[PDB]
Specification:
The protein folds into two domains: 1-176, no CATH class; 188-329, no CATH class. The protein contains nine helices and 14 strands. A six-stranded antiparallel β-sheet has the order 2-5-6-1-4-3. A six-stranded mixed β-sheet has the order 9-8-7-10-11-14, with helices on both faces. The chain is an alpha+beta fold and 384 residues long. The chain binds zinc ion (ZN). Zinc ion (ZN) binds next to loops. The structure holds three DNA and RNA strands. It is classed as rna binding protein/rna/dna. The entry lists the keywords RNA, Complex, RNA binding protein/RNA, RNA BINDING PROTEIN-RNA-DNA complex.
RNA sequence: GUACCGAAGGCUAUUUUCGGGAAUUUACGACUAUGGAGUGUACAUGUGAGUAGAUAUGAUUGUCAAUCCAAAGCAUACACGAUGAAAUAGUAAGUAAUGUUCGUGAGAACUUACAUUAUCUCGAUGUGAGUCACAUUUUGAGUGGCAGCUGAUGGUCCAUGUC
DNA sequence: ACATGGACCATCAGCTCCTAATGG
DNA sequence: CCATTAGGAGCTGATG
């Protein structure tokens, strides 16, 4: 049972400069490996495998030119990890799993630094502070939410990140699973929609978190901040005052607003899944929703993006696999929103803008409720 | 002491706490020195436009025919503003006392006591001395009530502005 | 069509051994 | 000298 415990940390200035330098070197190494591979193909030679690119770097390039040996000044493990995940892009493009590599490009916050447990005595953790191989003891803001070494827990590896003025660490731990739950309640089903987040085939209704006053106020604030930030770029285009500081401040503010909205939405999804799973059903059937096609509709794109259907599905699948539940999903073209629950009529004149379902037998119910009931008693499905 | 901003890892708290605090009620966080006229709202007003976009909805061999359907911008209305808007460059966001130095300024550093989650603080239990020490302890905890499975690669969408 | 600078979407995986240097 | 802590090599054979 692989897990992760992502927590915010408290580096010092000397540790902050180390983190920044390591990330910069890793980005440079990724780009350099890509370019050298391109040049080799241009000539007509074979493919360098990354594990051999490192050997070429250590024994055939770095001695040759003494100009750039700052590479062996930052941790030698993060550099190797960056090279390997650069070669993973190529090995995924050779197979038809992905597209051609993409040249990380200077300046973002998506590149992290990787550390591993090398010796039998590092990566020791307490209620406060953790020991990371590149930096030493690093303080931890939240106490107890990282498996300590006092109570027989071991960290395999980890990653240090940086998002909007804050720093985080994410460590992965093998967890033993106990308390085998016995599921015996009647099964349920949930329909995912845009008027409400979810409607369950038992009566429970979860409203759209995006239709609340707080999120609307946040969106207004974000639009105002973006409009104010775009004036500084226009001003910068004219003069020669290239010492942008208010631009950095505005960028930080925009990133903070985005992060806050993400926090609200993620908390809502996690708590909703918690309540649904704690209700303890035997099985649940959901859908095979296609979000790309729905997002191709211009007037539905923003709402569908802000609803986060696929993330909810993945987290629900993880929790179901963890709690011993079974997840059922149906075909992409299963007639859920058109089939009556009494006679089985598959009426076709159902307009997309009707909130009430009415067929010939006289059955009348909400469209979402009818869809949830159709989902709960589905016959053909394949378990996720 | 309201809307907002900083901190207490995240969400929430009308009856959690410590600070700053308005262009003041679907309510443009506050000051500093230059800078001189704009900035904000229309989720409680029209046109762009049945237009872009989507259709496991029908007919002939890409059109026809039915069902849902934007946004930018322009135009209007209202609000605040020469008691100083945008932009540029900075300052602070635990409490008291004393006296210097530094900066144009908001302010900062060096001393004292308090408070506080100071690479730890607290609780509990046991032993010993006469309230203080030494050990063990996460099934103990970090303002209440609640939840946290991350990384890599690629793809696709979105917002703001100029022409 | 350029820049700005974000988010979510699908699918696939999560590091060991041996040597060689560092502080009193 | 010495428990610690760092570095170098490893596979994969492929229409940037
Ligand atoms: Zn019927």
């Amino acid at each position: 049972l692989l897990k992760s415990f992502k927590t915010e940390i408290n580096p010092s200035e000397e540790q902050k400069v180390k983190i920044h330098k390591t990330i910069g070197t890793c980005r440079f190494i990724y780009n350099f490996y890509l370019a050298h591979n391109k040049e080799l193909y241009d000539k007509g030679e074979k493919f360098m495998s990354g594990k051999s690119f490192s050997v070429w770097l250590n024994n055939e390039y770095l001695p040759q030119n003494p100009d750039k040996l700052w590479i062996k000044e930052v941790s030698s493990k993060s550099v190797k990890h960056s090279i390997e995940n650069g070669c993973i892009a190529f090995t995924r493009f050779f197979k038809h799993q992905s597209a051609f590599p993409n040249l990380k490009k200077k300046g973002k916050s998506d590149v992290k630094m990787y550390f591993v447990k090398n010796n039998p005595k590092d990566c020791r953790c307490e209620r406060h502070r953790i020991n990371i191989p590149s930096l030493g003891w690093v303080r931890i803001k939240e106490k107890g939410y990282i498996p300590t070494t006092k109570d027989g827990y071991v960290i395999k590896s980890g990653t240090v990140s940086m998002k909007a003025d804050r720093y985080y660490v994410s460590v992965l731990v093998e967890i033993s699973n106990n308390k085998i739950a016995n599921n015996s309640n009647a099964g349920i089903g949930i329909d995912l929609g845009l008027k409400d987040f979810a409607i369950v085939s038992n009566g429970k209704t979860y409203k759209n978190i995006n239709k609340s006053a707080r999120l609307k106020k946040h969106e207004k604030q974000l639009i105002r901040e973006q409009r104010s930030l775009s004036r500084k770029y226009e001003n910068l285009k004219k003069g020669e005052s290239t010492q942008k500081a208010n631009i950095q401040k505005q960028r930080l503010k925009v990133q903070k607003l985005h992060h806050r909205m993400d926090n609200i939405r993620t908390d809502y999804i996690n708590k909703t899944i918690a309540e649904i799973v704690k209700t303890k059903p035997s099985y649940i059937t959901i859908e095979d929703l296609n979000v790309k096609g729905m997002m191709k509709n211009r007037h539905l794109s923003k709402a569908v993006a802000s609803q986060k259907f696929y993330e909810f599905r993945t987290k629900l699948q993880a929790k179901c696999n963890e709690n011993g539940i079974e997840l059922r999903v149906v075909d992409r073209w299963y007639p859920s929103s058109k089939t009556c629950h009494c006679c089985g009529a598959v009426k076709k004149d159902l307009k997309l803008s009707d909130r009430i379902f009415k067929c010939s037998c006289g059955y009348v119910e909400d469209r979402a409720f009818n869809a949830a009931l159709n989902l709960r008693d589905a016959i053909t499905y394949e378990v996720a």
